[PDB]
Symmetry: C10
Subunit: 90 residues, 10 copies
Amino acid sequence: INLANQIFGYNGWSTEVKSVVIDFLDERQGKFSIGCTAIVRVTLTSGTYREDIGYGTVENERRKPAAFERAKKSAVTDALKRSLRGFGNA
Amino acid sequence: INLANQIFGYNGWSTEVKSVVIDFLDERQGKFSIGCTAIVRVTLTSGTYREDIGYGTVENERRKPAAFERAKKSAVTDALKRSLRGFGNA
Amino acid sequence: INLANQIFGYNGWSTEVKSVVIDFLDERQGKFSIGCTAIVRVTLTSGTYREDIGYGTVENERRKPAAFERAKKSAVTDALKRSLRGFGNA
Amino acid sequence: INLANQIFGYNGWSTEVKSVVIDFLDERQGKFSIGCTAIVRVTLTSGTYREDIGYGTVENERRKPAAFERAKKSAVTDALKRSLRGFGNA
Amino acid sequence: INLANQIFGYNGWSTEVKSVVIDFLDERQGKFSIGCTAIVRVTLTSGTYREDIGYGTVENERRKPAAFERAKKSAVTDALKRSLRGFGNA
Amino acid sequence: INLANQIFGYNGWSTEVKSVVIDFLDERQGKFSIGCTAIVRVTLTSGTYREDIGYGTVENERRKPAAFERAKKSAVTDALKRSLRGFGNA
Amino acid sequence: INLANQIFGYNGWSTEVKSVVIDFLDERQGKFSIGCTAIVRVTLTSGTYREDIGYGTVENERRKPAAFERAKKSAVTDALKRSLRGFGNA
Amino acid sequence: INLANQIFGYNGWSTEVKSVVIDFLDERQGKFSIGCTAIVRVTLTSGTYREDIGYGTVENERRKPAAFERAKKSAVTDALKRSLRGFGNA
Amino acid sequence: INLANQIFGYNGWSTEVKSVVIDFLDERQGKFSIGCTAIVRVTLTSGTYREDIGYGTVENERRKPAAFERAKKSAVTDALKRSLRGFGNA
Amino acid sequence: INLANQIFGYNGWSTEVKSVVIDFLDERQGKFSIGCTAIVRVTLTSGTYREDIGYGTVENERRKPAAFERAKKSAVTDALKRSLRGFGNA
């Protein structure tokens, strides 16, 4: 993630999470196999964006952190997917 | 997709997903046959937009990654359809 | 479709799929006879727009590819309706 | 329609279908008597719009997609209604 | 209506149908007695406007053109009501 | 009503029917005793708006023009109430 | 109300009825004891507003003008409440 | 309230009633013990704005002026809370 | 609260209660243990806004002022949470 | 959070809680295990924004401050994730 804040400047690239929505909710023998779709929209200092969508899922999560960490992995998967789409080296 | 970044500038073309919708969900013998339609937008450096619409489907997906890669691959095929429709070589 | 990119410049005309809506869904003998209507508004550089409506239909599509095909054919019909509606030769 | 492109310029008038709605749906002995109401808004190069309301109908069309052409005829008769209301010869 | 196009410039007055609503629906011995209220706003070239509303009703219409000409007569009656409301001779 | 067009210029004052709302509906022995509240807003050439509310009610109307003249009379009495509020003599 | 037109100019003080809501409806021995709440904002020529809220109620109204004079009296008393709020003598 | 009109100018301080919400309704032995919340803002001639909420409650109000106190006393106490919040002496 | 007006200018800060919401309603033998969530946004004269979220609760309140607790507990808690977040001494 | 006020100026960064929503509510042996997601958006003086989401959970909270603590500490965890994502040292 810091590689992005390294290719662009400390005030070069921005983030605006459009929508983060739940896909399903499971209760099978206490397992919570749930996923989420997140759409972040980066904005370089040149006013060029790269909106995309990423997914984040968790399988068992008995303690009920299934809604805890799914959000962060989904959001960071989308940040990685934006770099995959463009700005691979610049 | 990288060819689009090659033909345009590194800050020449953009992407604005505005409509990701899942149409049907199946439960047949555990298999999930689901589809998704994605509509994106592009603010080109010259301010021209080749909006379009793409579709992606998955047949069995026993582990339920059906809702996982449907969105990503629908978005990528719709971005490909954007090149297919307009900007054939430029 | 490429003739539109030819009679105009590579950045001459635009496209904005305003509304794609499906009308019905059939299951008679496992056949899916479904049709959708789509509205688009191409935009010339001068700013003139041409809004239309286009309908795309499929008859049997037993393995349910209808949703995949309906959008593409509706968009193609919509664009042809634009071409006949205006800018026939310029 | 081409006569309108003749009196005006190739980039003189516009078109905007913003309200296309379906009043009823009949299945009398398989026949589909359905109608639709469409509202267009043409815009001259001088900026003087002209918005009216046009209606179309179909009587039998035992083919299930009787919705295929209703929109087209409603829109064209609504454009004809715009021609009738104003700009009769210019 | 052509008298309005005569007193005003061909590009002098404009028109936009704000709302077109259906009051009721009757099925008495197959006869349809239905009415609509239409609100249009006209706009002179000087920027002044004259909003008003009009009503159009049909009694029997056994063929069911009851929804066919109700809208046209409502819009016509309401433009006439605008003419009587203001711009009587200029 | 014409006195308003006389004290102001033909292009001095305007009118904007903001909202017409039907309070109730009656069916007693076929008689329709119904009313409506119309809120119009006028605008002088000096940009001084005068918004108000008026009401028109019918008592019997066996033929059912009860929804026909209620709206027009309500709009008229509200336009009159606007003059009662301000612009009495100017 | 005319005193407000006297203290200010003929085009100095404006009115904008923003929210008229009736809270309840009674049918007790046919008598209608109903109330209405009206919120309007006035505007001086100096671009200073003075928003408030007033209430108009009626008790018996056997003829059912209960919905007739409620709005008029609510708007009147709310304008009076604006006068009490500010512009007491100017 | 007049002290506010004294500390600032006659056209220096404004009022914008934003949200009046009725909390509940009581019918106990005909007594109406009801409360209301009013959110208003004031605007100073310098462009600064103070926004707050105020609550008004009534216990018995056998005659049912309970809704009458909503329009007056809740707004009054919220306006007082605005002065409490700021501009205590200037 | 007055200390914030003291470090700031008399017209330097602003308050905007964005959202006051009820969380729950409890009726325990007359007790009302309810809490409310208030999000307010402040704005300094330098155009530097600062949003946050505050909470205010009441335990027994047999007299039912449990709804009025707001602007006296919850909103002032948000005013204090904003002060804690930033502008600790300036 | 004060460290952010140290690296940036007293009027350098901002905060805007765009959406806080509670995920679930548990009533197990009186204990409440609830979670909340908050989306804040910091804004630097240079018009650069870190939009992000964070989560806050509470397990037992028998007294029911569960809806009280989560709102504050989830927003705090998410403002911390702001620094975790960007502006590591500046």
